[PDB]
Amino acid sequence: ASVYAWNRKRISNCVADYSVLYNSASFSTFKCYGVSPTKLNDLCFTNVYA
């Protein structure tokens, strides 16, 4: 989507494996602010937004 019409997706009721996202090198920039990326595999949230 365009910047002024950015796409928003809502995620719930699933198991997420962020490890496969982090170990992949396909991304130029991967920056986590409130959490440590290596700790994401343990915390359980609700109401994820992408």
Next chain:
Amino acid sequence: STASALGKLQNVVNQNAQALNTLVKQLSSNFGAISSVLNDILSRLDPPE
């Protein structure tokens, strides 16, 4: 029959209890950090922060 004739001892007890209560409740403050519980900070962040 008449009550409230022992205000001094009751006053002492109340003061002590109130001080202890506020000391305990101070443990829920934030002090400018992101959270007031050590476990959540420890289980969400890398040490350097």
